[PDB]
Amino acid sequence: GLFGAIAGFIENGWEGMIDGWYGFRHQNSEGTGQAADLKSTQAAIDQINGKLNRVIEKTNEKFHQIEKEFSEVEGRIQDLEKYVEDTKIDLWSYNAELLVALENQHTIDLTDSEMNKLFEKTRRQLRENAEEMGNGCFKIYHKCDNACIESIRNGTYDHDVYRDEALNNRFQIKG
Amino acid sequence: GLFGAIAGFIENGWEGMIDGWYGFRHQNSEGTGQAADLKSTQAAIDQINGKLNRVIEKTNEKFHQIEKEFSEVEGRIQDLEKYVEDTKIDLWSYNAELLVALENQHTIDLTDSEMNKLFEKTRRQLRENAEEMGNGCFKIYHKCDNACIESIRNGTYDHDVYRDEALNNRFQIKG
Amino acid sequence: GLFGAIAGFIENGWEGMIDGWYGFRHQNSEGTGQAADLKSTQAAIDQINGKLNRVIEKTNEKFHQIEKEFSEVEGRIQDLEKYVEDTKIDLWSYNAELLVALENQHTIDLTDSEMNKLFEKTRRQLRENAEEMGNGCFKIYHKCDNACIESIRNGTYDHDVYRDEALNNRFQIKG
Amino acid sequence: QDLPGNDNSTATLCLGHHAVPNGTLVKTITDDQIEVTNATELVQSSSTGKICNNPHRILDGIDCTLIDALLGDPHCDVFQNETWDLFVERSKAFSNCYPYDVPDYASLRSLVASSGTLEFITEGFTWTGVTQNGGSNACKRGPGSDFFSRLNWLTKSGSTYPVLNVTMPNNDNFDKLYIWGIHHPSTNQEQTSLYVQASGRVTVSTRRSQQTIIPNIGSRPWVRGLSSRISIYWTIVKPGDVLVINSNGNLIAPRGYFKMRTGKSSIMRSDAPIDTCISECITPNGSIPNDKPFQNVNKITYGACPKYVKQNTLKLATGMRNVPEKQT
Amino acid sequence: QDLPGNDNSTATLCLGHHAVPNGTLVKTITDDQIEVTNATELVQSSSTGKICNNPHRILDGIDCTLIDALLGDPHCDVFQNETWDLFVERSKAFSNCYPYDVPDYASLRSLVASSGTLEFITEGFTWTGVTQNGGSNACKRGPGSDFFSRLNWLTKSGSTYPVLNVTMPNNDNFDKLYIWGIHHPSTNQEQTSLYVQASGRVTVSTRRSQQTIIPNIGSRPWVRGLSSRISIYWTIVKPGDVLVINSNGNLIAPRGYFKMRTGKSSIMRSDAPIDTCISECITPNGSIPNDKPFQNVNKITYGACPKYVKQNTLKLATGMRNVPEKQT
Amino acid sequence: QDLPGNDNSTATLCLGHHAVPNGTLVKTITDDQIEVTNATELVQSSSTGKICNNPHRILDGIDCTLIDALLGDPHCDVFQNETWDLFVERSKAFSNCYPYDVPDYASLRSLVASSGTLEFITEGFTWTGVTQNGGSNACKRGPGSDFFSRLNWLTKSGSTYPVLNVTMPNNDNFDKLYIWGIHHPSTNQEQTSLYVQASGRVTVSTRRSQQTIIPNIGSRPWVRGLSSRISIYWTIVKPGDVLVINSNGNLIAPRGYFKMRTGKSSIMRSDAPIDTCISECITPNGSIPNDKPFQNVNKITYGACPKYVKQNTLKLATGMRNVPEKQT
Ligand SMILES: *[C@@H]1O[C@H](CO)[C@@H](O[C@@H]2O[C@H](CO)[C@@H](O[C@@H]3O[C@H](CO)[C@@H](O)[C@H](O)[C@@H]3O)[C@H](O)[C@H]2NC(C)=O)[C@H](O)[C@H]1NC(C)=O
Ligand SMILES: *[C@@H]1O[C@H](CO)[C@@H](O[C@@H]2O[C@H](CO)[C@@H](O[C@@H]3O[C@H](CO)[C@@H](O)[C@H](O)[C@@H]3O)[C@H](O)[C@H]2NC(C)=O)[C@H](O)[C@H]1NC(C)=O
Ligand SMILES: *[C@@H]1O[C@H](CO)[C@@H](O[C@@H]2O[C@H](CO)[C@@H](O[C@@H]3O[C@H](CO)[C@@H](O)[C@H](O)[C@@H]3O)[C@H](O)[C@H]2NC(C)=O)[C@H](O)[C@H]1NC(C)=O
Ligand SMILES: *[C@@H]1O[C@H](CO)[C@@H](O)[C@H](O)[C@H]1NC(C)=O
Ligand SMILES: *[C@@H]1O[C@H](CO)[C@@H](O)[C@H](O)[C@H]1NC(C)=O
Ligand SMILES: *[C@@H]1O[C@H](CO)[C@@H](O)[C@H](O)[C@H]1NC(C)=O
Ligand SMILES: *[C@@H]1O[C@H](CO)[C@@H](O)[C@H](O)[C@H]1NC(C)=O
Ligand SMILES: *[C@@H]1O[C@H](CO)[C@@H](O)[C@H](O)[C@H]1NC(C)=O
Ligand SMILES: *[C@@H]1O[C@H](CO)[C@@H](O)[C@H](O)[C@H]1NC(C)=O
Ligand SMILES: *[C@@H]1O[C@H](CO)[C@@H](O)[C@H](O)[C@H]1NC(C)=O
Ligand SMILES: *[C@@H]1O[C@H](CO)[C@@H](O)[C@H](O)[C@H]1NC(C)=O
Ligand SMILES: *[C@@H]1O[C@H](CO)[C@@H](O)[C@H](O)[C@H]1NC(C)=O
Ligand SMILES: *[C@@H]1O[C@H](CO)[C@@H](O)[C@H](O)[C@H]1NC(C)=O
Ligand SMILES: *[C@@H]1O[C@H](CO)[C@@H](O)[C@H](O)[C@H]1NC(C)=O
Ligand SMILES: *[C@@H]1O[C@H](CO)[C@@H](O)[C@H](O)[C@H]1NC(C)=O
């Protein structure tokens, strides 16, 4: 969509992630593994419920209207009765068709957005200690055990704690 | 909104900023201060005026139409007169309701966009001399007096002037 | 538009680029050159064709309807015949006017998006070897002959190959 | 901040999003089939096939038309003083009394259907010099030749038929619907036998309107043994006004008034079975749920209903784009 | 570039956006109450309660209906040859002349209201063998029994009402509206007193149409001492055509023609006071400003007006999201 | 990896997008003139000026109205049993037979135009005691005084016009359209000469309806030497029903039935030339292509057509924003 995260710089989705919509999958000293992100999953889910409820809002009720089926041939007034209803129907059908089109387009960019926002939020947190590998993965340039990985995920990672270690083997001139 | 600057990486707004919509706040060895940004404020304001005028564009005028209130019970032709107008009204009410909804959604993402664009523009200007603190603030890694702060704000900051100073205490290995 | 690449951080377009919509210009040891990017040009073109075909989709056909021109003055039924058609026309004209407006707005942000996405994709590929000059140009900090420029453009650039060279004259403290 | 570490290694963190193996196709502004994680249908397209008898008052007409119920065809005597939110007319309804026609039947059917009450009040009309309560062999009420319960056929007394001139004020504070008619005989012999004058006349008026109908003598197709017809007409008399009925022949007189009211009542032609359940939205095909914004079941509806649309499916993506690994 | 410094320090630059302490709630695609810095109302919902007399020509009907003004009821003689962009009919209007009814009153009221002129031209009709200028005690013009100024009641002279056959060509280049009628007597005695023939007839024709009305004798409710009625009919005669009026009784003859025109004129029922001000948009509730795109005051409108909508408020956010430091 | 290079140099890579020197202005949500690289028009605004004779069956009426073609005015005898998808009526069409008028002409023109067939079936009506095949000098068929080919004028036989009472069942399985009429004489002399009875009557009925028309004697404007008129009426008789025509004067009898059908046929007034080409969308101004979604040529259309809109241009940007470096 507009941001190019989903079906973009993130080559594909994870059928394996059954606990949330967006998430992290890490590899580190203490093994490997993944974890769903719940705040972005909720942000995406709430927005979609929000548009959904607004679409499903009040049905207008109508009682006595005009007749819409005729069993006799009458001419002018009946021709006008059929025309008023046929132009009403085509106008509401146009409306329902444009509505889901705009709506769907926006749901795909909104969820593209949330993916990209998690990406950027994680990027900002790691400060000078990681590099983008351009496929949605950061390379963290310092020893990051599972508690370190958990602090990135729960937003408490202190980059200063690792800046010297990181910076040093990040700018490792020798190869 | 879609970019995640307003009500996103920028925790909140400034009730104190009465001179513009977007702006800058700083802390240097001389002191503190804030200053509105007028170009992004105008970009945001013009766009909003633009959509506003288009909405407020030409009223269609109508003169003799059909009757819309009846004081006698007539049956078929009057039923069709009431139906033509009731379906006209529900169609225009749908239109006004979808219009402000699309419009409002777009005004919130457009202003989110302008905030994020100022952010990125400032980011690009500071080149290797500053770091993102992830909350909308750059940490400038070199002595930046009020004239230096003003050159960032008026777009004339020369990053080369400070690159060595910056880079040196930026990659300060010792802690 | 919303991303600020086109008519934003990229000061202007190239009337000289006749082989594609988005593209690269460069200067390297081997001389100067430009080259269109075909994947982003196709992404932008396909999306625009997609919306275009949907707009140009099925015409509804109508046969016997009501009369719409009268040569005698009749009063009530004719007044209703003229009103049903006049409200139909104003409703379809509103629809066509809002449609091209939404559509056009989205085409300009969609193409702004593709420009910015190429920019970001190139940015990610160059990793620590280049710097943004903030005007849509990367400064590549290592010798990059025309085959090196071609590997950036066809997505096969290996940043590790040049990381030490790059990093060294990137953080060249002396000035 | 910390001391020089004796170890040196990196870690990898990848962000991503889920994908499902199933996945639904949805239309967009730029694509008309793009696959998303999940979607929801916005077009209701099926009915139970039953008209739920709640919350609206459905009155099944069984084999009576609303106009026959109104006029009082013997076989519809059940509907006397009945009331409804929706009168359902059945395709198998039939009339079985004197052959009548209603000039602008369609408006009479509308304005009765719309007030939703058949409550009748007999008024003391006094017809002097004519014979009341005429009836016929084609409108048998029970084992007897009879007529519409709400109309009073008038013929000659002994040798003559006078110029009826009667009045009936509306002294109440509601409108009164009066239904009356005129008898068109088959032959001039029939005319004179019943009404003496060779040419009858009915004029029914109030302070603000009048109707004068002259009968039409001639043979029509035999229906129920008869070639004569009665035509039905209606007069609303507002509070404070006066009905005056004046005739020198062929009058089918009113026995009083139906009272009118304003409400949410209508009529619907449907052969759907009424069943005991609660549904707000009624379609001739039976009730339909009104959770979805649009429906494709039927353009005729009564009650809180989805907007009828031409489309039969319209999926709202309620999830991101589905970009799977290996597909299934 | 420059030389090694002695001081070493950093600076902090933070970007941000304003917020307001007040802030308005607005609907969105995904939220229906989200707070923004500022918004503007798009539904006009209040009238001054006065119909501004500018720029359209408002003609206040005072206590005359447009049809009575047209026919020329004595108390409406003021409106003779009057003109309008909007004729306002008042709820307290009353008629006060011979009791008439207009079959399809609603179209006559429309096409007069729409041409916006009551300019009348007397034509020299010559009625030979009848008495002109009949009038009545229920239509007193001043201290005199009179009739509608634009119609000419004709009665017999002696014991002859001849067969009137008159013609009047349209030799102009504009259509001519002719208004005529027929008198329905209460009794056959009245019929013969006035018109001799026991059954009158009026046939009014042009080259492309004809109307034959036969009168209807019978008592109607007493209004202004009378139980008789006249019914009003209209004929437009196009340039180059011919009116032919032929009758042997009960003709209420035309005195000439109203001339028709095409314009932006209409009629409106309203008891609002006309005042001196300028407003383009008129509602029965008085004028309303037309700065906003939509209005909720009234569905009846005349002039450049906002589109009527069901909603009474519809706020367009004209500012960013309001995210204040403390709260709202 | 490689060995140290003695050169030390950088490269510059700039991304960008094209621009065109031409460029089109387009409306947006926030701007109403913004310049883009390219755009495409969505409002069709010009016709060829010719009605293409493909794929719909166009039937040019030449100088015949559909009602005259139906009735069988001599000069329209060509259209006998003709068929159409679109009947085109020409402004120069003229009638040239007995002067008639059709009460509710507009519905008769509609329901014939809509069934799209003028196929007529003669039925064996037997009129006993009257003279068939009356004709007139104003409806000359060839060198002979004649009448409408599909109607049968009836006058008395010798000294009496009996009471015609005839029947004709619909035993087929399609509806039958019958067209009949009544003759309004100019004078009572004319009346008695032709029909003996001083007052004729026509009653036409089926099991479910009836029509009784009484003629109207009086002079009308002379058209084609005549001041008399015939008025045309129509009766649809459904399968299994019965037509009964009963009259004692002034009947213009039917010669059988037009058969009705359901289809996509209509009628259009246009003086456009029919030409040989294929176009699906027809406008009174000639055919128009239907590639664009909207058209501004004309609100009257037949066939697969663009939606008529008030706007005459509506450009869809099909390219990015045009930001030229020099300009041109
Ligand atoms: C005028 O013409 C109509 C039609 O030609 C005549 O109508 C027919 O009248 C006869 C005589 O009563 C009806 O006969 C009855 O038919 C039923 C059903 O078949 C049968 O059971 C009875 O025993 C009797 O035969 C016939 O149905 C009726 N048909 C129609 C279509 O109306 C009418 O009698 C003529 N009237 C005069 C006064 O000339
Ligand atoms: C036919 O029946 C109607 C209604 O029964 C008769 O109408 C009534 O006629 C009387 C006699 O003129 C009217 O009386 C007058 O009433 C006015 C108003 O109250 C009053 O000013 C007079 O002093 C006198 O009382 C009465 O109003 C009128 N009422 C109605 C409702 O029309 C009519 O006379 C009968 N006609 C014949 C020829 O039988
Ligand atoms: C009733 O009044 C009408 C109108 O005043 C009379 O109509 C006119 O009748 C005369 C006598 O036939 C028509 O004259 C004819 O004119 C044509 C064309 O100029 C000419 O070719 C004929 O040979 C003859 O001279 C005249 O056109 C006609 N005009 C109109 C407008 O209808 C009618 O005769 C009167 N009828 C009676 C019985 O009093
Ligand atoms: C974040 O994770 C770390 C590492 O497990 C833990 O100690 C810390 O308390 C967590 N903080 C929050 C707010 O979840
Ligand atoms: C920007 O600010 C600097 C520092 O005060 C000033 O010298 C310079 O002239 C300003 N330039 C512009 C274009 O405002
Ligand atoms: C990319 O360009 C390089 C340099 O010319 C070339 O050797 C390489 O094969 C190209 N690869 C692709 C996939 O185009
Ligand atoms: C799909 O979306 C609908 C509407 O939000 C919801 O009821 C349903 O649970 C969703 N399906 C899944 C598998 O989440
Ligand atoms: C119908 O209701 C009225 C009003 O109370 C009553 O007088 C009348 O007798 C009722 N008739 C029947 C058959 O219920
Ligand atoms: C509903 O009934 C109509 C006929 O009344 C039929 O044509 C239509 O297909 C039905 N639709 C459904 C969903 O039952
Ligand atoms: C709010 O918006 C409207 C429309 O743009 C404008 O007239 C008004 O000045 C704005 N309010 C403020 C406080 O800026
Ligand atoms: C009405 O206008 C006509 C046209 O000039 C004039 O002849 C006539 O006398 C006028 N009558 C009155 C009462 O103004
Ligand atoms: C306008 O007048 C109508 C009655 O004509 C009334 O129901 C409506 O509420 C009024 N609205 C306003 C805003 O005055
Ligand atoms: C402009 O757009 C239309 C529709 O996409 C296309 O047919 C045409 O080729 C485009 N023009 C150019 C110069 O590409
Ligand atoms: C019209 O069609 C019918 C049906 O076959 C035929 O009997 C009749 O003779 C035809 N008449 C003409 C003039 O074609
Ligand atoms: C089409 O014809 C109508 C008259 O029928 C005319 O007013 C209109 O301007 C014409 N438009 C075009 C594009 O020919």
Write a three-state SS string for chain C: CCCCCECCCECCCECCCCCCCEEEEEEECCEEEEEEEHHHHHHHHHHHHHHHHHHCCCCCEECCCCCCCCCCCCCHHHHHHHHHHHHHHHHHHHHHHHHHHHHHHHHHHHHHHHHHHHHHHHHHHHHHHEEECCCCEEEECCCCCHHHHHHHHCCCCCHHHHHHHHHHHHCCCCC
Q: Assign residue D43 a region: left if phi > 0, alpha if psi is -120 to 50, beta otherwise? A: beta
* Chain F contacts to D (CB-CB under 8 A): 165, 167, 201, 203, 205-210, 212, 241-242, 244, 246-247
Answer whether E81 contacts ligand 11 (Cβ < 6 A): yes
Cα F128 from Cα D312, distance rounded (Å): 61
- The answer to whether the CB of A28 falls within 8 A of the CB of A149 is yes
CA E121 to ligand 11: nearest atom = 3
For residue D126, CA distances in Å to B141, D164, D252, D254 come to: 110, 10, 14, 11
DSSP letter for F47, please: -
Residue E38: its chain B contacts at CB < 8 A? none
Which residue's CA is the closest to the ligand 2 atom numbered 4?
Answer: D167
CB contact under 8 A, E106 and C72: no
Residue B83: its chain A contacts at CB < 8 A? 65-66, 84
Minimum CA–CA partner of A128 in chain B: B131
Cα B64 from Cα C73, distance rounded (Å): 14
- The answer to whether the CB of D139 falls within 8 A of the CB of D148 is yes
Cα A74 from Cα F299, distance rounded (Å): 24
Which residue's CA is the closest to the ligand 5 atom numbered 3?
Answer: B151
Cα A98 from Cα D27, distance rounded (Å): 10
CB contact under 8 A, F236 and A79: no
Answer whether F22 contacts ligand 13 (Cβ < 6 A): no
- The answer to whether the CB of F194 falls within 8 A of the CB of F257 is no
Cα E111 from Cα C41, distance rounded (Å): 62
Q: Three-state SS for D112?
A: helix
Whether domain E57-272 has CATH 3.90.209.20:
yes
Minimum CA–CA partner of A46 in chain E: E30
- The answer to whether the CB of E217 falls within 8 A of the CB of E137 is no
Cα D302 from Cα D316, distance rounded (Å): 26
Residue from D328, D325, D317 nearest D38 by CA: D317
Q: Is the peptide bond before E55 cis (omega within 30 degrees of 0)?
A: yes
- The answer to whether the CB of B109 falls within 8 A of the CB of E321 is no
* Residue E40: its H or E element: strand E39-41
Pairing relationship of beta strands E130-134 and E251-254 according to DSSP bridges: unpaired
Cα C165 from Cα C161, distance rounded (Å): 9
Please name the residues in contact with C52: beta carbons below 8 A apart, sequence gap of 6 or more. F40, F316, F318
Q: Which one of the ligands is nearest to E299 CA?
A: 12
Q: Three-state SS for E27?
A: coil
Cα E139 from Cα E199, distance rounded (Å): 25
Half-sphere exposure of A61 (CA within 13 A, CB side): 12
Answer whether F298 contacts ligand 15 (Cβ < 6 A): yes
Cα F318 from Cα C100, distance rounded (Å): 11
Q: Domain residue spans in chain C? A: 1-175
Strand blocks (E) in E201-241 = 202-205, 210-213, 229-237
Minimum CA–CA partner of D310 in chain A: A93
Chains with at least 3 CB pairs less than 8 angstroms from chain C:
A, B, D, E, F
Q: Output the CA A113–ligand 10 centroid distance in Å.
A: 30
DSSP B45-80: HHHHHHHHHHHT-PPPEE-S------SS---HHHHH
Cα C153 vs. chain centroid, distance in angstroms? 18
Cα F153 from Cα F176, distance rounded (Å): 21
Structurally, at CATH architecture level, domain A1-175 sits in: Alpha-Beta Complex (3.90)
Residue E20: its chain B contacts at CB < 8 A? 15
- The answer to whether the CB of D18 falls within 8 A of the CB of A127 is no
Cα F175 from Cα B138, distance rounded (Å): 86
- Note which residues in 303-322 of chain E have CB less than 8 A from chain B: 303-311, 314-322
Q: Which one of the ligands is nearest to A145 CA?
A: 4
E167, E242, E246 ranked by CB distance to F218: nearest: E246
Specify the amino acid at residue C171. Answer: F
- The answer to whether the CB of D297 falls within 8 A of the CB of D216 is no
Question: Angle of helix B38-55 relative to helix B76-126, nearest 10 degrees?
Answer: 170
Chains with at least 3 CB pairs less than 8 angstroms from chain D:
A, B, C, E, F
* Residue F86: its H or E element: strand F86-89
**Bridge-partner residues for B22, per DSSP?**
B37, E17
Q: Is the peptide bond before F284 cis (omega within 30 degrees of 0)?
A: no
Rg (CA), chain C: 27
Please name the residues in contact with C136: beta carbons below 8 A apart, sequence gap of 6 or more. C5, C9, C10, C11, C119, F14, F15, F16
Please name the residues in contact with D22: beta carbons below 8 A apart, sequence gap of 6 or more. none
Which residue's CA is the closest to the ligand 2 atom numbered 29?
Answer: E222
- The answer to whether the CB of E8 falls within 8 A of the CB of B144 is no
Cα F324 from Cα C14, distance rounded (Å): 7
Residue from B4, B104, B99, B47 nearest E26 by CA: B104
Pairing relationship of beta strands D294-295 and D43-44 according to DSSP bridges: parallel
CB contact under 8 A, A76 and F175: no
Q: What angle do CA D64, D66, D67 make, to 5 degrees?
A: 105
- The answer to whether the CB of E36 falls within 8 A of the CB of E17 is no
Residue from F273, F278, F313 nearest F294 by CA: F313
Cα D42 from Cα C147, distance rounded (Å): 54
Cα E87 from Cα A171, distance rounded (Å): 88
- Note which residues in 10-29 of chain F have CB less than 8 A from chain A: none
* Residue E307: its H or E element: strand E307-308
Cα D146 from Cα D155, distance rounded (Å): 14
CB atoms within 10 A of CB E155: 18
The residue of E10, E27, E28, E29 whose CB has the most chain A CBs within 10 angstroms, and thus the best one to mutate to test that interface, is E29
Cα E16 vs. chain centroid, distance in angstroms? 59
Residue from D158, E80, E207, A162 nearest F223 by CA: E207
For residue F77, CA distances in Å to A173, C14, F80, F256 come to: 104, 71, 6, 17
Please name the residues in contact with B71: beta carbons below 8 A apart, sequence gap of 6 or more. none
- Note which residues in 87-106 of chain C have CB less than 8 A from chain D: 103, 106
Q: For chain D, what's the residue count?
A: 328
Please name the residues in contact with C42: beta carbons below 8 A apart, sequence gap of 6 or more. none
Answer whether F285 contacts ligand 15 (Cβ < 6 A): yes
Cα B105 from Cα F182, distance rounded (Å): 68
Q: Is the peptide bond before E169 cis (omega within 30 degrees of 0)?
A: no
Separation in Å, CA of A80 to nearest CA in chain C: 6
Cα E178 vs. chain centroid, distance in angstroms? 19
DSSP letter for D37, please: S
The residue of A54, A60, A160 whose CB has the most chain E CBs within 10 angstroms, and thus the best one to mutate to test that interface, is A54
Go through F18-46 and write b for each residue having 16 or more CB atoms within 10 A of its CB, e for each that does not: bbbeebbebbbbbbeebbbbbbbebbbbe
CB contact under 8 A, C75 and E1: no
For residue A31, CA distances in Å to A25, A155, D16, D135 come to: 11, 21, 19, 101
Cα F169 from Cα F164, distance rounded (Å): 17
For residue E265, CA distances in Å to B63, D257, E106 come to: 7, 42, 16
DSSP E87-121: EEEPTT----SS-EE-TTHHHHHHHHHHH-B--EE
- The answer to whether the CB of D258 falls within 8 A of the CB of D179 is yes
Residue from D235, D268, D258 nearest D117 by CA: D258
Half-sphere exposure of A91 (CA within 13 A, CB side): 25
CB atoms within 10 A of CB B149: 22
A54 touches chain E (CB under 8 A): yes
Which residue's CA is the closest to the ligand 7 atom numbered 10?
Answer: D38
Sign of CA dihedral B108, B111, B113, B115: negative
Tokens (6 digits) for D25: 């196709």
Q: What spatial distance separates the first Cα and last Cα of chain F, rounded to whole Å?
A: 49
Cα F314 from Cα F318, distance rounded (Å): 12
Please name the residues in contact with F188: beta carbons below 8 A apart, sequence gap of 6 or more. F198, F217
Strands of the B137-140 sheet, one edge to the other: B31-37, B22-28, E11-17, B137-140, B130-132
- Exposed, middle or buried by CB within 10 Å (0-12, 13-18, 19+), for B100? buried
Tell me the structure's resolution in angstroms, rounded to a single decimal. Answer: 3.0
Strand blocks (E) in F170-306 = 176-184, 202-205, 210-213, 229-237, 242-247, 251-254, 256-259, 266-269, 274-275, 281-283, 286-288, 294-295, 303-304
Cα F43 vs. chain centroid, distance in angstroms? 27
